[PDB]
Amino acid sequence: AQMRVVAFGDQTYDCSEAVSQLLRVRDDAIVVDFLERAPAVLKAELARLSSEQQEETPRFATLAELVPRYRAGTLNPAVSQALTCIAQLGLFIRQHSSGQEAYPTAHDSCITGVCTGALTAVAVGSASSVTALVPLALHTVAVAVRLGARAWEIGSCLADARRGANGRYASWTSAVGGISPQDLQDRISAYTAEQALASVSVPYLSAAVGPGQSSVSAAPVILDAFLSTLLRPLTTTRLPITAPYHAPHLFTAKDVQHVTDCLPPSEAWPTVRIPIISFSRDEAVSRGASFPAAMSEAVRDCLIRPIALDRMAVSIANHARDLGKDSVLPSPIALSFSDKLGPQVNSHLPGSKSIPSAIGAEQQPMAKSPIAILAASGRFPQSSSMDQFWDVLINGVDTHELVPPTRWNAATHVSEDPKAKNVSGTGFGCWLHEAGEFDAAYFNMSPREAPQVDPAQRLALLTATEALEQAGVVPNRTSSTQKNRVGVWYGATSNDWMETNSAQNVDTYFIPGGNRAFIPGRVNYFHKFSGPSYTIDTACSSSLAALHMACNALWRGEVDTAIVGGTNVLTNPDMTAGLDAGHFLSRSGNCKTFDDEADGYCRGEAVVTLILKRLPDAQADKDPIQASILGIATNHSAEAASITRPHAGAQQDLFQQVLTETGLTANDISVCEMHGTGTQAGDSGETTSVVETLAPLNRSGSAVRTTPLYIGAVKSNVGHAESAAGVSSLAKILLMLKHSKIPPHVGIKTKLNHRLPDLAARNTHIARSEVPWPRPKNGKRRVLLNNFSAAGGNTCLVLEDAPEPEDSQEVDPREHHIVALSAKTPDSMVNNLTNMITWIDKHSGDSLATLPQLSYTTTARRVHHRHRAVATGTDLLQIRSSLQEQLDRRVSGERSIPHPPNGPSFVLAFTGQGSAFAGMGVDLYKRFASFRSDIARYDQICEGMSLPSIKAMFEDEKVFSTASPTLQQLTHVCFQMALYRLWKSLGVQAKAVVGHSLGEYAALYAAGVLSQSDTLYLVGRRAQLMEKHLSQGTHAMLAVRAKEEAIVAAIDGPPGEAYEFSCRNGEQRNVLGGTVAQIQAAKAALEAKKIRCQYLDTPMAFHTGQVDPILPELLQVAAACSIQDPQIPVISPAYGKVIRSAKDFQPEYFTHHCRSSVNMVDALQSAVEEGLLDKNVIGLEIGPGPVVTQFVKEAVGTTMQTFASINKDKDTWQLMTQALAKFYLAGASVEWSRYHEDFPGAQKVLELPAYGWALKNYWLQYVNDWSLRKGDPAV
Amino acid sequence: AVAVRLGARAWEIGSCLADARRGANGRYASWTSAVGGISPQDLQDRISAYTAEQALASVSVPYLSAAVGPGQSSVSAAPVILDAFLSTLLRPLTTTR
Ligand SMILES: [Mg+2]
């Protein structure tokens, strides 16, 4: 019988941190809604204040901008009041929705509040649920801002602000200790008399706390003078209340009426349902008044009534006793000195983990979720890959060099002192010398079209495709990789190819090959991505600007996967000349970031493409993750003196903006990748903004940083990639995280720049030699990356280490694995083989889990082109030996040929029960969940129809000994239906089916004639009839290697009298049936002529006169089944014919099939003559052994490829993997993802070699130096 | 999640019991139909009689899935089988799919 009391505090509680916490919330939908609409409400009332108050009110888009001014003390009473009221309501709301705390009720709880808390108390007490509280809570926000605004107005009219305030709002209240309230009141009266103070300016007792404590308020100038008279032992603690409250001599009923005028009049206002403990009023307990009337009284508690805080404790206790409660459980919300409440109230008295959310709901909303960087590929100066790019950085290489002749002739375009037109003072740069290389065949370009395409568009296709494969992205494989969920963004500032190179002979592909919109467009078109496609031009910040746009799309949910990149290919001498004419460029060398003699930046070439995803999606697909983007923002340097020069004021506001949005602090960042274009003004300006944000200095001069900060610029190595600078900078970070190193900085040629601040004092460093950058245990490395433009815009992001991978995974029980290689060209095929072999030699003995993961990657996480290669084994060494052997044949002159266009054709052969064995299918049953489900489903169907249980056959094995014919036959058929469905799920679409004896039933389901249950019904009831009527051991069956003519000639007695032909399997393969006595006589007669004979294990003699007695009843069983036309042709040994119509599957069919001979030859020969079968078709046995396939093979040709699924002598997966290899080489589209689905241990994307492009140089050389003569006539 | 798992399991049994027809064109056939003009008990007798006279596996039989009112009820079965049974319920009886 405990009663919780909900107590709200006043302005004395520093709610700054609580506000910061609520802004970080993103898991409670009703909170974020309250926090979006509260500022709107707040801002709305602030617009109705007086001009004096509006001028002293800051501008803000969100509450985050008020926190710092609140902490500083420069926030006026109107906002700080509403802010405290927001924090209280916010904390209460979160506690009762996210915190799943039951809402208070009049039976077991009460609410109380002091000063501002009295407002919130009215709202809470007037609602019965969180949903109802919000609308009232928002009205309460407006009342709070009007309350502080009204008290602020009276204060300003009473006393003016003092001169040394510096914007800070002075204190109007102070706590006094060591004297009783009624004694302090007398000293006040005396002090008043002696100073002759006006009645309004007098100090007054604003609150009574305890027998010796109290609080006195007055104008600051007057309060200070009065407090100077209270000498020790008395105490004086100054409180943070910046306006007069609780002053019956300053406020009246009209002031209260004004504060609550924002509450529209209505009849639907809720009443106070939960008792409010109004201990500062005549009635300590109050309830029932309407929300406005209750709010007016609460406002009256703030302006008119003094705080009787000495009555708070007993007032609560008395209400608890009134309801027969023994104790109270305090639930304070932003209450100063709240801990003391519990004991103080109880002194007057005698005295489960949260449930996991449904999958898909645990994830936070898409808005402001970490965006994972899955992969990145690019081309950089002296670097054909990300790995060679790291070599440039870690070895401190300066890649700048004079312009090569492939671009333009420096002898005519460059001059020490440029006087002629279009001649520049510099010709330096960091160039991509292989920018012309491309694989036109791969991307479906003619040799005449490729030269016209901007190398930027080409290198975008290469890097984008490399990044996609590196990320294991296969279109439409998973939900996040659906074609309509993939978008493309690129940053590009220039189109030089279309201005200088192809413009020399405008041809048909001039526009599509030169226009920037085609940079992402070709990516969208080639990979068939129907999501958005954009190009961004913000000059030197384009790529990071595009990364910003892409992240917004992911956060908004327009796409699930994003392709982001940047391109910069320089072929127009005018651009360099123009840049030099504007003094952007360094005429001495590369970017000399941080060097005292920096004279500009050096143009650089680069192309980079990344793959992005919202972190949850990335983890759902088991994609690789190199890092995560926490935030990214953009502003503009509007406050600069010149349009070109950037300014530090705007840059810092951005750095702090992203730190706040991400919830981080300076210490959390350990590295900053700066813009750093090698400019004295730019480097000093940016450096000051970075340190003032990430390495601030104490007021005493010490370092705020506890750990060192490292700053560096990639441009000192590879120059300024302009539109591709942002992603180039980001690529460097991805490598720094991978290798856990900070590369040396080569920008400092001579001496450090003197404009920089004392970096050592701030614990900031410019690494001169490489520095270890290890990931902390159970921690993450976080980075700030900057990228600016001369147009004024600034962009920066916050980066973070990738999450820790899943520890468990699982061991792959499969002994044999399959590795798939593909290429579009014979040369590319040779390349991929070579590159895969060299890769296996590097990672040969690292771990045993590599081979399953290698298989998963090359199959499920790869597209498969027309030229194909395969290898299968149990360890990596076997795979190499196979691929090496295949490589040798390619080198010896046997070229790689593409698989036939249509792909393979399959015929499925369903075996009879003769070849079934114990423990058949157990490994399949264990490992494939779908197979287990089917068996489990069929089992329940059987028992439902009073048939034996087959699930035990796959689990127990021993039962196979004593199993009955009905159980033996059902197990076989369920096995075949489950085995067919498994192969169908793996991509085998049958061209036709053929079943032998019992195998026809499963074959009829695979053909679409019968449903699975009708098959089991038909099989079960037929076997039941055979046990009921027939007897084992009376008849037998005999296999004979001889022609039908020789068998008949050898035996005395015609067929149909002395015996019967049960099966006609081949030319010299027949099976006879009859009584044991009939077979004995025939077996001797055939052995007499030395013909090979052999009994069958079956107990009865199927397909002979023995089954005659069951045929009438079997006819009725078939009549019950629902027959439909086959979807694929049925090769029926029962009729020795290819069946295609349901007219042939009438009940007569099944009695005929049971009694009549099994004419495989006549059925097969009927199939080949129709062209349904030929040597190029693949035969797949759906049974316990390759029996029926041998009959098919004899019928079509000796070179036919036939495969078995199960075989008692070999491992199931060997056969399965060996068949899929041949299906793949034949051109089948295997469902590789399903092949690995039940094996999480293999589901890891490995970093494999990039596609072995068949590269040729496609270039349109700039000639005749015509750019230097633009505007001149022909002379 | 329970709802999707519920329908998936009923869907699995349905597919295992009866295959989708040839002229479905993606449209999912109806397994249940409402009957009017007859009492649930009387309709249950017509079902049992139809069962006796026709040839059906025990699992494929039509069954009374719901009793709505004194003259209303609902009968379910595989689409091909339900069509055959409903063809025997002649006016004044009613049949709403
Ligand atoms: Mg019947």
**DSSP secondary structure letters along A1224-1252:** HHTT----HHHHTTT-GGG------PPP-
Residues of A in contact with B22 (CB under 8 A): 1124-1125
Residue A807 makes CB contacts below 8 A (sequence gap 6+) with: none
Helix (H, G, I), strand (E, B) or coil at A974: helix
With contact defined as beta carbons under 8 Å apart, do B35 and B94 qualify?
A: yes
CA distance A1247 to A624: 9
Here the tokens at position B64 are 């009374």
Tell whether A910 and A795 lie within a shared domain. Answer: no
Helix (H, G, I), strand (E, B) or coil at A673: strand
The number of C-alpha atoms within 13 Å of A526 and in the hemisphere containing its C-beta is 21
With contact defined as beta carbons under 8 Å apart, do A587 and A413 qualify?
A: no
Q: Do B57 and A1012 touch (CB under 8 A)?
A: no
Chain A residues 1108-1147 with a CB less than 8 Å from chain B: 1116, 1119-1122, 1124-1125
- What Rg do the C-alpha atoms of chain B give, in angstroms? 14
Tell whether A782 and A920 lie within a shared domain. Answer: no
Longest dimension (CA), chain B: 43
Tell whether A589 and A738 lie within a shared domain. Answer: yes
CA distance A743 to A677: 17
Q: Which residues pair with A1037 in a beta bridge?
A: A1073
Question: What distance in angstroms lies between residue B54's CA and the mean position of ligand 1's atoms?
Answer: 4
In 3D space, the residue among A301, A568, A316 whose CA is nearest the CA of residue A454 turns out to be A568
Tell whether A544 and A426 lie within a shared domain. Answer: yes
In 3D space, the residue among A826, A857, A836 whose CA is nearest the CA of residue A442 turns out to be A826
CA distance A192 to A199: 9
Here the tokens at position A1123 are 């027959």
With contact defined as beta carbons under 8 Å apart, do A1074 and A1047 qualify?
A: no
Cβ atoms within 10 Å of A614's Cβ, excluding its own:
24
In 3D space, the residue among A913, A911, A966 whose CA is nearest the CA of residue A942 turns out to be A966
CA distance A133 to A119: 13
Comparing CB atoms, the residue among A359, A1017, A1122 nearest residue B18 is A1122
CA distance A332 to A339: 8
Query: Judging by beta carbons within 10 Å of its beta carbon (0-12, 13-18, 19+), is residue A1224 exposed, middle or buried?
Result: buried
With contact defined as beta carbons under 8 Å apart, do A759 and A766 qualify?
A: yes
Q: Do A1124 and B22 touch (CB under 8 A)?
A: yes
Write the DSSP string, A470-488: HTT--TTSSSTT-GGGEEE
Comparing CB atoms, the residue among A944, A1011, A1120 nearest residue B56 is A1120
Q: Say whether residue A944 is in contact with chain B using an 8 A CB cutoff.
A: yes
Q: Say whether residue A929 is in contact with chain B using an 8 A CB cutoff.
A: no
CATH code for the domain of A677: 3.40.47.10
Q: What is the dihedral of CA A933, A938, A942, A947, to 10 degrees?
A: -100
Question: What distance in angstroms lies between residue B46's CA and the mean position of ligand 1's atoms?
Answer: 13
Here the tokens at position A789 are 């433009």
Q: Say whether residue B9 is in contact with chain A using an 8 A CB cutoff.
A: no
Question: What distance in angstroms lies between residue A1010's CA and the mean position of ligand 1's atoms?
Answer: 19
Helix (H, G, I), strand (E, B) or coil at A223: helix
CA distance A547 to A549: 5
Q: How many CB pairs lie under 8 A apart between chains A and B?
A: 48
Give backbone dihedrals phi and psi of A1046, rounded to 5 degrees, phi first. -70, -40
Tell whether A996 and A1123 lie within a shared domain. Answer: yes
Tell whether A932 and A1061 lie within a shared domain. Answer: yes
Q: Do B12 and A1012 touch (CB under 8 A)?
A: no
DSSP strand pairing (A213-217 vs A173-177):
antiparallel
Comparing CB atoms, the residue among A941, A1011, A1119 nearest residue B18 is A1011
CA distance A791 to A643: 7
Instruction: Compute CA distances A952 → A39, A914, A1027, A1206, whole Å.
Output: 67, 20, 21, 19
Residues of B in contact with A1124 (CB under 8 A): 19, 21-22
Helix (H, G, I), strand (E, B) or coil at A913: helix
Shortest CA gap A449–chain B (Å) = 44
User: What are the percentages of helix, strand and coil residues in chain B, rounded to 5?
Assistant: 40, 20, 40
Chain A residues 339-398 with a CB less than 8 Å from chain B: 358-359
With contact defined as beta carbons under 8 Å apart, do A937 and B16 qualify?
A: yes
In 3D space, the residue among A708, A782, A711 whose CA is nearest the CA of residue A747 turns out to be A711
Range of the domain at A1086: 906-1226
Residues of B in contact with A973 (CB under 8 A): none
Comparing CB atoms, the residue among A1014, A1124, A1125 nearest residue B57 is A1014
Identify whether A720 is a catalytic site residue.
yes
Comparing CB atoms, the residue among A946, A1013, A1121 nearest residue B16 is A1013
- Edge-to-edge, what's the strand order for the sheet holding A1060-1066? A1093-1095, A1035-1040, A1069-1075, A1060-1066, A1158-1159
Helix (H, G, I), strand (E, B) or coil at A558: coil
Chain B residues 26-45 with a CB less than 8 Å from chain A: none
H/E element, A872: strand A867-873
- Edge-to-edge, what's the strand order for the sheet holding A1202-1204? A1137-1139, A1130-1132, A990-995, A906-910, A1178-1182, A1202-1204
Catalytic residue among A262, A430, A540, A1154: A540
Q: Say whether residue B93 is in contact with chain A using an 8 A CB cutoff.
A: no
Q: Do B19 and A1013 touch (CB under 8 A)?
A: no
Shortest CA gap B1–chain A (Å) = 7
CA distance A81 to A87: 10
CA distance A29 to A34: 9
Alpha helices, H only, A174-324: 181-195, 220-227, 253-259, 291-303, 312-322
CA distance A272 to A261: 19
Helix (H, G, I), strand (E, B) or coil at B86: helix
Write the DSSP string, A610-627: EEEEEHHHHHHTT---SE
Question: What distance in angstroms lies between residue A978's CA and the mean position of ligand 1's atoms?
Answer: 30
Here the tokens at position A149 are 């605004």
CA distance A118 to A526: 65
Q: Which residues pair with B35 in a beta bridge?
A: B73, B95
Here the tokens at position A1191 are 């009959």
Tokens 């919300």, located at residue: A333
Tokens 């009708």, located at residue: A1014
Which method was used? X-ray
Identify whether A1063 is a catalytic site residue.
no
For A709-733, b/e burial (b = at least 16 CB within 10 A) is: bbbbbbbbbbbbbbbbbbbbbbbbb
Residue A1200 makes CB contacts below 8 A (sequence gap 6+) with: A1175, A1177, A1178, A1179, A1192, A1193
For A984-994, b/e burial (b = at least 16 CB within 10 A) is: eebbbebebbb
User: What are the percentages of helix, strand and coil residues in chain A, rounded to 5?
Assistant: 40, 15, 40
Q: What is the dihedral of CA A977, A980, A981, A985, to 10 degrees?
A: 170
With contact defined as beta carbons under 8 Å apart, do A684 and A756 qualify?
A: yes
With contact defined as beta carbons under 8 Å apart, do A348 and A246 qualify?
A: no
Q: Do B19 and A1017 touch (CB under 8 A)?
A: no
Helix (H, G, I), strand (E, B) or coil at B45: helix
Cited resolution, angstroms: 2.8
DSSP, res A531 = S
- What Rg do the C-alpha atoms of chain A give, in angstroms? 43
Amino acid letter, A1121:
C
CA distance A200 to A248: 10
Amino acid letter, A1041:
R
CA distance A1138 to A566: 61
Q: Do B57 and A945 touch (CB under 8 A)?
A: yes
CA distance A262 to A139: 8
CA distance A260 to A264: 9
Catalytic residue among A675, A1035, A1103, A1153: A675
DSSP strand pairing (A327-333 vs A285-286):
unpaired
Helix (H, G, I), strand (E, B) or coil at A272: coil
Comparing CB atoms, the residue among A941, A945, A1125 nearest residue B16 is A941
Residues of B in contact with A359 (CB under 8 A): 1
Write the DSSP string, A1071-1095: EEEEEHHHHHHHHHHHHHTT--EEE
In 3D space, the residue among A569, A584, A468 whose CA is nearest the CA of residue A526 turns out to be A468
Residues of B in contact with A1017 (CB under 8 A): 57, 59-60
Question: What distance in angstroms lies between residue B41's CA and the mean position of ligand 1's atoms?
Answer: 20
Tell whether A788 and A924 lie within a shared domain. Answer: no
Q: What is the dihedral of CA A1023, A1027, A1028, A1033, to 10 degrees?
A: 150
Shortest CA gap B2–chain A (Å) = 10
Q: Which residues pair with A635 in a beta bridge?
A: A794
With contact defined as beta carbons under 8 Å apart, do A327 and A351 qualify?
A: yes
Q: Do B59 and A941 touch (CB under 8 A)?
A: yes
Tell whether A1030 and A1147 lie within a shared domain. Answer: yes
Tell whether A792 and A920 lie within a shared domain. Answer: no
Residue A635 makes CB contacts below 8 A (sequence gap 6+) with: A650, A653, A654, A657, A793, A794
Residues of A in contact with B53 (CB under 8 A): none
Say how many residues make up chain B.
97
Instruction: Compute CA distances A171 → A155, A201, A240, A780, whole Å.
Output: 11, 15, 6, 43
Question: What distance in angstroms lies between residue A353's CA and the mean position of ligand 1's atoms?
Answer: 56
Residue of B50, B60, B63 for testing the chain A interface, max A β-carbons within 10 Å: B60
Question: What distance in angstroms lies between residue B67's CA and the mean position of ligand 1's atoms?
Answer: 24
CATH code for the domain of A1156: 3.40.366.10
**What's the CA angle centered on A388, arms A383 and A394, to 5 degrees?**
115
Give backbone dihedrals phi and psi of A805, rounded to 5 degrees, phi first. -65, 165
Q: Do B18 and A941 touch (CB under 8 A)?
A: no
Q: Do B81 and A1122 touch (CB under 8 A)?
A: yes
- Edge-to-edge, what's the strand order for the sheet holding A276-277? A285-286, A276-277, A109-113, A2-8, A327-333
Residue of B4, B9, B17 for testing the chain A interface, max A β-carbons within 10 Å: B17
Here the tokens at position A1141 are 């119509």
Q: Which residues pair with A330 in a beta bridge?
A: A5
H/E element, A870: strand A867-873
Tell whether A783 and A930 lie within a shared domain. Answer: no
Tell whether A403 and A538 lie within a shared domain. Answer: yes
With contact defined as beta carbons under 8 Å apart, do A797 and A788 qualify?
A: no
Amino acid letter, A764:
T
Q: Say whether residue B84 is in contact with chain A using an 8 A CB cutoff.
A: no
CA distance A866 to A898: 5
In 3D space, the residue among A940, A978, A1019, A1009 whose CA is nearest the CA of residue B59 turns out to be A940
Residue A700 makes CB contacts below 8 A (sequence gap 6+) with: none
With contact defined as beta carbons under 8 Å apart, do B54 and B39 qualify?
A: no
Shortest CA gap B11–chain A (Å) = 12
With contact defined as beta carbons under 8 Å apart, do A97 and A130 qualify?
A: yes
Cβ atoms within 10 Å of A171's Cβ, excluding its own:
17
Q: Please state whether the peptide bond connecting residue A696 to the residue before it is cis, i.e. omega within 30 degrees of 0.
A: no
Question: What distance in angstroms lies between residue B85's CA and the mean position of ligand 1's atoms?
Answer: 13
Residue A419 makes CB contacts below 8 A (sequence gap 6+) with: none
Say how many residues make up chain A.
1275
Q: Say whether residue A937 is in contact with chain B using an 8 A CB cutoff.
A: yes
CA distance A484 to A686: 41
Identify whether A843 is a catalytic site residue.
no
Give backbone dihedrals phi and psi of A831, rounded to 5 degrees, phi first. -60, -50
CA distance A178 to A521: 79
Tell whether A492 and A623 lie within a shared domain. Answer: yes
Q: Which long-range contacts (CB under 8 A, 24 or more apart) does A57-65 make?
A: A62/A23, A63/A19, A63/A23, A63/A35, A63/A38, A63/A39, A64/A20, A64/A23, A64/A660
Q: Do B19 and A1011 touch (CB under 8 A)?
A: yes
With contact defined as beta carbons under 8 Å apart, do A995 and A1129 qualify?
A: no
With contact defined as beta carbons under 8 Å apart, do A782 and A666 qualify?
A: no
Amino acid letter, A893:
G
Please state whether A251 falls in left (phi above 0), alpha (psi between -120 and 50) or beta: beta
Give backbone dihedrals phi and psi of A543, rounded to 5 degrees, phi first. -65, -45
Instruction: Compute CA distances A911 → A324, A969, A980, A1018, A1023, whole Å.
Output: 82, 12, 12, 17, 17
